[PDB]
Short mmCIF file of C-alpha atoms in Angstrom, two decimals:
data_model
loop_
_atom_site.label_atom_id
_atom_site.label_comp_id
_atom_site.label_asym_id
_atom_site.label_seq_id
_atom_site.Cartn_x
_atom_site.Cartn_y
_atom_site.Cartn_z
CA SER A 1 -5.69 -50.03 -51.50
CA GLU A 2 -5.53 -49.20 -47.68
CA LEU A 3 -4.53 -45.89 -45.96
CA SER A 4 -1.17 -45.48 -44.82
CA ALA A 5 0.12 -44.49 -41.43
CA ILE A 6 0.45 -40.85 -42.63
CA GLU A 7 -2.61 -40.83 -44.63
CA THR A 8 -4.71 -41.91 -41.83
CA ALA A 9 -3.25 -39.24 -39.35
CA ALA A 10 -3.87 -36.82 -41.76
CA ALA A 11 -7.33 -37.86 -42.32
CA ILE A 12 -8.00 -37.92 -38.63
CA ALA A 13 -6.76 -34.45 -38.28
CA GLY A 14 -8.63 -33.20 -41.14
CA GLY A 15 -11.86 -34.15 -39.91
CA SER A 16 -12.69 -36.94 -42.47
CA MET A 17 -12.60 -39.36 -39.45
CA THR A 18 -12.08 -40.12 -35.94
CA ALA A 19 -9.50 -41.80 -33.97
CA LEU A 20 -12.14 -44.11 -32.82
CA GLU A 21 -13.60 -44.56 -36.38
CA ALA A 22 -10.09 -45.51 -37.52
CA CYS A 23 -9.65 -47.79 -34.88
CA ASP A 24 -13.04 -49.55 -35.26
CA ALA A 25 -12.13 -49.81 -38.93
CA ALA A 26 -8.67 -51.64 -38.27
CA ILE A 27 -10.56 -53.96 -35.95
CA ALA A 28 -12.82 -54.64 -38.52
CA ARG A 29 -10.18 -55.47 -41.25
CA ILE A 30 -8.43 -57.85 -38.40
CA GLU A 31 -11.66 -59.51 -37.46
CA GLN A 32 -12.53 -60.03 -41.22
CA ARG A 33 -9.10 -60.96 -42.53
CA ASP A 34 -7.19 -62.53 -40.01
CA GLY A 35 -9.14 -65.96 -39.72
CA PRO A 36 -6.67 -67.77 -42.43
CA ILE A 37 -3.47 -65.86 -41.70
CA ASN A 38 -3.59 -65.56 -37.84
CA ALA A 39 -1.09 -62.76 -37.90
CA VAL A 40 -2.61 -60.56 -34.76
CA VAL A 41 -2.60 -63.23 -32.10
CA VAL A 42 -2.68 -60.63 -29.10
CA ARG A 43 -5.71 -58.32 -29.15
CA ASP A 44 -6.38 -55.32 -26.84
CA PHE A 45 -9.46 -54.35 -28.77
CA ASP A 46 -11.03 -53.07 -25.56
CA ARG A 47 -8.28 -50.69 -24.22
CA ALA A 48 -7.52 -49.76 -27.68
CA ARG A 49 -10.87 -48.35 -28.45
CA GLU A 50 -10.54 -46.13 -25.32
CA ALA A 51 -7.23 -44.78 -26.03
CA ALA A 52 -8.82 -43.95 -29.56
CA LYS A 53 -11.59 -41.98 -27.77
CA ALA A 54 -9.21 -40.21 -25.60
CA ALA A 55 -7.08 -39.35 -29.09
CA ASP A 56 -10.49 -37.93 -30.28
CA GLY A 57 -10.48 -35.63 -27.25
CA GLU A 58 -7.00 -34.30 -28.11
CA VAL A 59 -7.80 -33.78 -31.80
CA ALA A 60 -11.01 -31.54 -30.85
CA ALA A 61 -9.16 -29.64 -27.98
CA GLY A 62 -6.45 -28.50 -31.03
CA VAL A 63 -4.12 -31.02 -30.44
CA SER A 64 -2.02 -32.53 -33.35
CA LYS A 65 0.68 -35.30 -33.34
CA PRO A 66 2.10 -37.12 -36.21
CA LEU A 67 0.70 -40.35 -35.55
CA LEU A 68 -2.68 -39.45 -33.62
CA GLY A 69 -5.15 -41.56 -33.44
CA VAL A 70 -3.24 -44.12 -35.84
CA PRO A 71 -3.85 -47.78 -35.20
CA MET A 72 -0.98 -50.08 -35.20
CA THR A 73 0.23 -53.54 -33.69
CA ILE A 74 3.86 -54.32 -32.91
CA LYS A 75 5.82 -57.38 -32.49
CA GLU A 76 4.74 -59.66 -29.54
CA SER A 77 8.43 -59.54 -28.14
CA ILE A 78 8.33 -56.03 -27.71
CA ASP A 79 6.50 -54.89 -24.33
CA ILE A 80 3.37 -53.48 -24.09
CA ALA A 81 2.11 -52.36 -20.52
CA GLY A 82 -0.70 -54.74 -19.75
CA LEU A 83 0.13 -57.26 -22.49
CA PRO A 84 1.65 -60.85 -22.59
CA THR A 85 5.34 -60.93 -23.80
CA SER A 86 6.13 -64.42 -24.15
CA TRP A 87 8.54 -64.73 -27.41
CA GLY A 88 6.47 -67.81 -28.06
CA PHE A 89 7.08 -70.09 -25.02
CA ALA A 90 4.65 -71.82 -23.55
CA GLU A 91 6.29 -71.31 -19.81
CA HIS A 92 5.97 -67.47 -20.70
CA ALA A 93 2.42 -67.48 -21.80
CA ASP A 94 1.36 -65.80 -18.76
CA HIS A 95 4.54 -63.47 -18.48
CA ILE A 96 2.57 -59.81 -18.63
CA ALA A 97 4.79 -56.63 -19.14
CA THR A 98 4.58 -53.99 -16.59
CA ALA A 99 5.71 -51.07 -18.73
CA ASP A 100 5.70 -50.11 -22.43
CA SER A 101 9.06 -50.59 -24.36
CA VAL A 102 10.67 -47.34 -25.16
CA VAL A 103 9.88 -47.88 -28.80
CA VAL A 104 6.33 -48.02 -27.86
CA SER A 105 6.64 -45.35 -25.46
CA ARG A 106 8.08 -43.14 -28.37
CA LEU A 107 4.98 -44.01 -30.92
CA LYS A 108 2.45 -43.53 -28.12
CA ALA A 109 3.79 -40.02 -27.61
CA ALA A 110 3.51 -39.68 -31.17
CA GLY A 111 -0.22 -40.26 -30.74
CA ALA A 112 -0.39 -44.04 -32.13
CA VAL A 113 -2.86 -46.54 -30.85
CA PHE A 114 -1.80 -50.10 -30.33
CA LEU A 115 -4.35 -52.56 -31.11
CA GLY A 116 -2.73 -55.69 -30.27
CA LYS A 117 0.60 -57.61 -31.15
CA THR A 118 1.70 -59.85 -33.99
CA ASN A 119 2.93 -63.46 -34.01
CA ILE A 120 6.54 -64.78 -33.73
CA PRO A 121 8.15 -68.45 -33.72
CA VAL A 122 9.50 -69.82 -30.84
CA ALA A 123 12.74 -67.94 -29.15
CA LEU A 124 12.28 -65.36 -31.76
CA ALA A 125 14.46 -68.22 -33.71
CA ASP A 126 13.19 -69.14 -37.19
CA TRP A 127 12.06 -67.67 -40.50
CA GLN A 128 8.76 -68.66 -39.86
CA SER A 129 6.02 -67.74 -36.94
CA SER A 130 4.71 -70.54 -35.33
CA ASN A 131 4.52 -71.49 -31.64
CA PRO A 132 2.30 -73.39 -29.24
CA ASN A 133 0.55 -70.23 -27.51
CA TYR A 134 -1.03 -68.85 -30.57
CA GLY A 135 -0.49 -70.97 -33.65
CA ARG A 136 1.18 -70.46 -36.99
CA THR A 137 1.02 -67.42 -39.00
CA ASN A 138 0.49 -67.99 -42.91
CA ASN A 139 1.60 -65.98 -45.78
CA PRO A 140 -1.33 -63.75 -47.43
CA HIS A 141 0.06 -63.93 -50.81
CA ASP A 142 -0.09 -67.97 -50.44
CA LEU A 143 -1.47 -69.40 -47.38
CA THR A 144 0.57 -72.65 -47.83
CA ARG A 145 4.18 -70.78 -47.34
CA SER A 146 5.82 -68.88 -44.61
CA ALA A 147 5.06 -65.59 -43.55
CA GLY A 148 8.95 -65.35 -42.71
CA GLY A 149 9.88 -64.80 -39.18
CA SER A 150 10.56 -63.62 -36.49
CA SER A 151 8.54 -60.55 -37.14
CA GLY A 152 6.27 -62.86 -39.81
CA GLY A 153 2.92 -61.81 -38.06
CA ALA A 154 4.12 -58.19 -38.63
CA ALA A 155 4.58 -58.65 -41.94
CA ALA A 156 1.59 -60.66 -42.66
CA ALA A 157 -0.75 -58.11 -41.22
CA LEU A 158 0.75 -55.43 -43.34
CA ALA A 159 0.71 -57.28 -46.37
CA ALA A 160 -3.23 -58.22 -45.67
CA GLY A 161 -4.01 -54.50 -45.03
CA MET A 162 -4.78 -54.84 -41.44
CA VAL A 163 -2.73 -51.77 -40.37
CA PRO A 164 -0.67 -49.28 -41.93
CA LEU A 165 2.31 -49.59 -39.61
CA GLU A 166 4.57 -51.92 -37.56
CA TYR A 167 7.94 -52.42 -35.79
CA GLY A 168 9.86 -55.49 -35.67
CA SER A 169 13.56 -57.14 -34.38
CA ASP A 170 16.49 -58.66 -36.48
CA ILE A 171 19.62 -60.54 -35.71
CA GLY A 172 19.45 -62.82 -38.16
CA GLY A 173 17.05 -61.29 -40.97
CA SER A 174 13.90 -61.08 -38.95
CA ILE A 175 12.91 -57.77 -40.48
CA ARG A 176 14.26 -58.09 -43.86
CA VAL A 177 13.23 -61.71 -44.49
CA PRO A 178 9.49 -61.42 -43.78
CA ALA A 179 8.98 -58.05 -45.33
CA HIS A 180 10.65 -59.86 -48.16
CA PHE A 181 8.37 -62.92 -47.97
CA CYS A 182 5.41 -60.81 -47.61
CA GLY A 183 5.89 -58.15 -50.31
CA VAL A 184 6.29 -55.23 -47.64
CA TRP A 185 8.85 -52.57 -46.58
CA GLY A 186 11.30 -53.33 -43.87
CA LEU A 187 14.08 -51.61 -42.36
CA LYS A 188 16.80 -53.40 -40.27
CA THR A 189 18.42 -50.29 -38.50
CA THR A 190 22.08 -49.18 -37.94
CA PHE A 191 23.33 -50.98 -34.49
CA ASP A 192 22.28 -49.25 -31.60
CA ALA A 193 20.40 -46.38 -33.29
CA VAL A 194 16.84 -47.58 -31.64
CA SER A 195 16.59 -48.57 -28.03
CA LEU A 196 16.11 -52.02 -27.47
CA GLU A 197 14.38 -51.17 -23.65
CA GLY A 198 11.37 -53.61 -23.64
CA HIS A 199 12.69 -56.06 -26.15
CA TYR A 200 13.58 -58.50 -23.22
CA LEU A 201 13.73 -62.10 -22.97
CA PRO A 202 10.62 -62.88 -20.44
CA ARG A 203 11.00 -61.89 -17.02
CA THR A 204 14.53 -60.34 -17.48
CA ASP A 205 15.33 -56.52 -17.79
CA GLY A 206 19.17 -56.42 -19.04
CA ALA A 207 21.20 -54.86 -21.64
CA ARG A 208 20.77 -54.99 -25.41
CA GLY A 209 23.28 -57.72 -27.00
CA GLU A 210 25.18 -57.67 -29.81
CA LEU A 211 24.18 -57.67 -33.44
CA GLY A 212 20.42 -57.35 -32.97
CA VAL A 213 18.09 -54.00 -33.73
CA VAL A 214 14.89 -53.00 -33.74
CA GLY A 215 13.28 -51.37 -36.72
CA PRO A 216 9.87 -50.26 -38.81
CA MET A 217 7.87 -52.03 -41.10
CA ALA A 218 5.45 -50.52 -43.32
CA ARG A 219 3.84 -50.65 -47.04
CA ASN A 220 5.72 -47.44 -48.04
CA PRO A 221 8.94 -45.81 -47.42
CA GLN A 222 7.14 -42.59 -45.89
CA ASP A 223 5.88 -44.35 -42.92
CA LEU A 224 9.17 -46.13 -42.37
CA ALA A 225 11.08 -42.70 -42.18
CA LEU A 226 8.43 -41.13 -40.07
CA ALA A 227 8.56 -44.15 -37.75
CA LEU A 228 12.47 -43.91 -37.53
CA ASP A 229 12.51 -40.45 -36.62
CA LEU A 230 10.20 -40.87 -34.10
CA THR A 231 11.71 -44.05 -32.39
CA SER A 232 15.53 -43.47 -32.78
CA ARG A 233 17.14 -42.50 -29.73
CA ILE A 234 18.82 -39.43 -31.38
CA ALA A 235 17.80 -37.82 -34.63
CA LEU A 236 19.63 -39.66 -37.45
CA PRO A 237 21.43 -37.89 -40.49
CA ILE A 238 18.71 -36.80 -43.02
CA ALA A 239 18.68 -38.27 -46.55
CA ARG A 240 21.61 -36.75 -48.69
CA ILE A 241 20.33 -38.53 -52.08
CA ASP A 242 17.65 -36.92 -54.47
CA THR A 243 18.35 -38.48 -57.68
CA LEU A 244 19.62 -41.95 -58.76
CA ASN A 245 21.55 -39.82 -61.47
CA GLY A 246 25.38 -40.77 -60.35
CA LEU A 247 24.06 -42.97 -57.34
CA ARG A 248 26.87 -45.29 -57.17
CA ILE A 249 25.76 -49.04 -56.78
CA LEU A 250 27.40 -52.15 -55.89
CA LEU A 251 25.47 -55.07 -57.28
CA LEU A 252 25.93 -58.12 -55.87
CA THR A 253 23.83 -61.25 -57.03
CA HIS A 254 26.47 -63.98 -55.89
CA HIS A 255 27.54 -65.30 -52.37
CA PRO A 256 30.48 -67.39 -52.02
CA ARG A 257 28.48 -69.06 -49.33
CA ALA A 258 24.83 -69.34 -50.42
CA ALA A 259 22.95 -69.86 -53.70
CA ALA A 260 20.12 -67.56 -55.09
CA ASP A 261 17.15 -68.64 -57.50
CA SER A 262 17.44 -67.37 -60.81
CA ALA A 263 14.08 -65.52 -60.19
CA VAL A 264 15.71 -63.88 -57.17
CA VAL A 265 18.75 -62.71 -58.91
CA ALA A 266 16.77 -61.60 -62.11
CA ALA A 267 14.70 -59.54 -59.95
CA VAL A 268 17.46 -57.79 -58.12
CA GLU A 269 19.32 -57.46 -61.31
CA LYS A 270 16.16 -55.84 -63.05
CA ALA A 271 16.07 -53.26 -60.09
CA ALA A 272 19.55 -52.25 -60.94
CA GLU A 273 19.19 -51.86 -64.39
CA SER A 274 16.09 -49.72 -63.63
CA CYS A 275 18.46 -47.22 -61.65
CA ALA A 276 21.20 -47.26 -64.38
CA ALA A 277 18.65 -46.00 -66.97
CA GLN A 278 17.97 -43.10 -64.46
CA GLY A 279 21.66 -42.58 -64.23
CA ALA A 280 22.99 -44.75 -62.05
CA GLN A 281 26.70 -46.16 -61.92
CA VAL A 282 26.34 -49.84 -61.21
CA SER A 283 29.37 -51.84 -60.79
CA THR A 284 29.31 -55.50 -60.22
CA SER A 285 32.85 -55.91 -58.26
CA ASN A 286 35.35 -54.21 -56.08
CA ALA A 287 38.68 -55.37 -54.58
CA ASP A 288 37.53 -53.33 -51.57
CA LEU A 289 34.72 -55.76 -50.88
CA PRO A 290 35.35 -57.61 -47.48
CA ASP A 291 35.95 -61.48 -47.60
CA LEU A 292 32.11 -62.45 -47.77
CA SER A 293 32.91 -65.94 -46.60
CA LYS A 294 34.98 -65.03 -43.69
CA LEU A 295 32.38 -62.71 -42.58
CA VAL A 296 29.83 -65.42 -42.45
CA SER A 297 31.89 -67.73 -40.45
CA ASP A 298 32.78 -64.92 -37.89
CA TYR A 299 28.96 -63.87 -37.67
CA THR A 300 28.11 -67.50 -37.01
CA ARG A 301 30.43 -67.90 -34.35
CA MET A 302 29.44 -64.82 -32.68
CA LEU A 303 25.75 -65.38 -33.14
CA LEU A 304 25.64 -68.54 -31.50
CA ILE A 305 27.50 -67.16 -28.36
CA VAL A 306 25.04 -64.27 -27.92
CA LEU A 307 22.07 -66.39 -28.12
CA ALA A 308 23.85 -68.88 -25.91
CA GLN A 309 24.54 -65.86 -23.44
CA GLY A 310 28.12 -67.11 -23.23
CA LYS A 311 27.00 -70.40 -21.58
CA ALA A 312 28.05 -73.77 -23.17
CA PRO A 313 26.52 -77.13 -23.49
CA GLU A 314 27.60 -79.62 -20.49
CA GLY A 315 30.83 -81.14 -21.30
CA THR A 316 32.09 -78.39 -23.59
CA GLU A 317 34.20 -75.60 -22.13
CA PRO A 318 32.74 -71.78 -22.69
CA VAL A 319 34.34 -68.85 -24.60
CA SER A 320 36.64 -66.95 -22.31
CA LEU A 321 35.94 -63.45 -21.70
CA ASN A 322 39.57 -62.48 -23.22
CA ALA A 323 38.37 -64.52 -26.50
CA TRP A 324 35.00 -62.52 -26.54
CA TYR A 325 36.94 -59.43 -26.60
CA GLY A 326 38.89 -60.71 -29.54
CA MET A 327 35.80 -61.63 -31.24
CA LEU A 328 34.51 -57.98 -30.90
CA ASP A 329 38.21 -56.70 -32.43
CA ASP A 330 37.77 -59.29 -35.49
CA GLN A 331 34.10 -57.67 -35.71
CA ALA A 332 35.58 -53.80 -35.46
CA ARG A 333 38.12 -54.74 -38.12
CA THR A 334 35.60 -56.23 -40.95
CA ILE A 335 33.53 -52.96 -39.99
CA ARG A 336 36.39 -50.92 -40.91
CA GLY A 337 36.59 -52.96 -44.02
CA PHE A 338 32.78 -51.74 -45.05
CA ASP A 339 33.93 -48.25 -44.28
CA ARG A 340 36.63 -48.26 -47.13
CA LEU A 341 34.14 -49.87 -49.35
CA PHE A 342 31.46 -47.30 -48.79
CA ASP A 343 34.04 -44.81 -49.93
CA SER A 344 33.34 -46.02 -53.58
CA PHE A 345 29.73 -46.86 -53.12
CA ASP A 346 26.24 -45.15 -51.92
CA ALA A 347 24.51 -48.87 -51.65
CA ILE A 348 25.02 -52.31 -52.23
CA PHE A 349 22.23 -53.95 -54.09
CA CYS A 350 21.76 -57.69 -53.25
CA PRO A 351 19.00 -60.24 -52.31
CA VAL A 352 17.38 -60.56 -49.08
CA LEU A 353 17.53 -64.61 -49.11
CA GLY A 354 18.04 -66.68 -52.11
CA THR A 355 14.21 -67.79 -52.56
CA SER A 356 10.91 -66.50 -51.86
CA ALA A 357 8.76 -67.77 -49.14
CA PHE A 358 9.24 -71.50 -48.62
CA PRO A 359 6.63 -74.07 -47.68
CA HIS A 360 5.77 -74.45 -44.25
CA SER A 361 8.26 -76.72 -42.52
CA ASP A 362 7.40 -78.52 -38.97
CA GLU A 363 11.45 -79.41 -38.83
CA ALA A 364 12.83 -77.89 -36.12
CA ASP A 365 16.61 -78.29 -37.01
CA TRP A 366 17.55 -76.27 -39.74
CA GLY A 367 20.18 -78.78 -40.56
CA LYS A 368 17.45 -81.15 -41.67
CA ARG A 369 15.44 -78.76 -43.95
CA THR A 370 16.47 -77.89 -47.64
CA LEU A 371 15.46 -75.04 -50.09
CA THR A 372 14.69 -75.71 -53.54
CA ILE A 373 16.76 -73.22 -55.77
CA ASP A 374 16.61 -73.66 -59.56
CA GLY A 375 15.49 -77.32 -59.01
CA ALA A 376 18.17 -78.67 -56.73
CA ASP A 377 17.68 -79.08 -53.15
CA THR A 378 20.25 -76.87 -51.57
CA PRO A 379 21.03 -76.46 -47.48
CA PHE A 380 18.65 -74.12 -45.67
CA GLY A 381 21.03 -72.39 -43.20
CA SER A 382 23.42 -71.54 -45.93
CA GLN A 383 21.08 -68.64 -46.33
CA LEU A 384 22.28 -66.78 -43.40
CA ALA A 385 25.07 -65.48 -45.72
CA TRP A 386 22.47 -62.90 -47.66
CA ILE A 387 21.69 -61.27 -44.09
CA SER A 388 25.18 -61.37 -42.61
CA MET A 389 26.75 -58.32 -43.92
CA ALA A 390 24.45 -55.48 -42.24
CA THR A 391 23.94 -57.74 -38.82
CA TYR A 392 27.49 -58.29 -38.31
CA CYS A 393 28.92 -54.94 -39.21
CA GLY A 394 25.90 -53.17 -38.03
CA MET A 395 24.87 -51.14 -41.13
CA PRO A 396 21.21 -50.27 -42.01
CA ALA A 397 19.62 -52.47 -44.58
CA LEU A 398 16.22 -52.02 -46.38
CA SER A 399 13.96 -54.81 -47.77
CA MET A 400 11.65 -53.68 -50.33
CA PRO A 401 9.44 -55.24 -52.71
CA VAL A 402 10.84 -55.63 -56.50
CA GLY A 403 8.86 -58.21 -58.19
CA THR A 404 7.10 -61.56 -57.96
CA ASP A 405 8.66 -65.11 -58.47
CA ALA A 406 6.54 -67.16 -61.36
CA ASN A 407 4.50 -68.65 -58.44
CA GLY A 408 3.11 -65.32 -57.65
CA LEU A 409 4.96 -64.67 -54.24
CA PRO A 410 7.03 -61.69 -53.46
CA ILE A 411 10.84 -61.04 -54.18
CA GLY A 412 12.57 -58.15 -52.29
CA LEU A 413 15.72 -56.44 -52.61
CA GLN A 414 18.21 -55.74 -49.82
CA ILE A 415 19.75 -52.24 -50.06
CA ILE A 416 22.58 -51.80 -47.79
CA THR A 417 24.08 -48.39 -46.81
CA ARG A 418 26.61 -47.29 -44.52
CA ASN A 419 26.57 -47.00 -40.78
CA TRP A 420 23.72 -44.61 -39.89
CA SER A 421 22.58 -43.59 -43.14
CA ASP A 422 19.44 -45.47 -42.58
CA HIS A 423 17.50 -42.48 -44.10
CA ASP A 424 19.64 -42.64 -47.23
CA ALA A 425 18.65 -46.55 -47.69
CA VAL A 426 14.73 -45.66 -47.21
CA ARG A 427 15.42 -42.92 -49.78
CA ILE A 428 17.06 -45.18 -52.64
CA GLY A 429 14.28 -47.80 -51.93
CA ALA A 430 11.88 -45.02 -52.65
CA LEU A 431 13.56 -43.93 -55.91
CA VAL A 432 14.12 -47.56 -56.94
CA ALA A 433 10.40 -47.91 -56.52
CA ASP A 434 10.09 -44.84 -59.04
CA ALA A 435 12.47 -46.44 -61.46
CA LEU A 436 10.57 -49.45 -61.51
CA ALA A 437 7.20 -48.00 -62.06
CA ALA A 438 8.86 -45.68 -65.02
#
């Protein structure tokens, strides 16, 4: 029942409230609600209110901008000038960013006001949000369960109504998974569509690596689309879809490399059937589908080199540059596989993860964790499979809410579309949400 980012900005423009009122309202929601959740772990309420007063001076001087005065937070790994950027490392608790990231600079240019930053796991390397600098973030829907990660505090802050807009990062599901666990909307954008300048490992300032993207998170698709138009390095193509009638969907509720709970499958299946009733052509199989089992292995191989920065454990020999160049050839061949697939389909519908939010785990080694799927214990890491298609091949991928499991925990749907059609993904998810309400 909270105002959206667009609605807030309209309110501030129309006279209904001052940016400073909106900024103190958000501070109030945060101080009153973040106690048991612990999502907004870096606070800048003092400078935020100064910037809000300023946003009020612009308003009264006749100025308008699409997010003027709108309070929001950002992920702790994205730089804001004057604020820490530790990525959850004790050794970098006091690393203080000198300059706004590009994404932050873009949104501040749209008039937004940054109240603070949201919690993350150590090294952005978990589907939870816990670290020694700030503590743990808890799912607002069940405080005993993970908020997801690594953008987990962002998803929790959105879910608890604290702010209307957020922005996150994803290399192994870290936008889509928190959005799914907390019941909010998250967009993994097309690879290279938004700049990662300011999303730096603490004390470094180099180049974007492969695979990872930044993308917006919110409670509705309109805010996502606005936030994407304001942050993309070039204006992206606009949405071609306007109706589910004739939309061509490929429904995947099975992965050769990971299981999915019945309640997740059923939630995803029901979303496709709602679209079919508004006229969609839902297929369950296609011979153009790339080998998803090979894809998961290529993705893993490359992921572990990227995250290691090509360095190797002492005793092991590193990957050669030429071998790396071969790995990008492989990646490139696979991407072309999805190009042919998307000649026959407008979207893939599949799960974000095989389960809804799991109980907090203090076990660092994914190999020692499990996940209950239909009563059985199943391997935890196996679930990267659901997340691999869009990261490895670079496609945009929405995570949107489509139901709740039997315990009341949110379940999300992953909507994948062709490279650079990020707005078509957000549009389809908006129409999916309509079809499910009708």
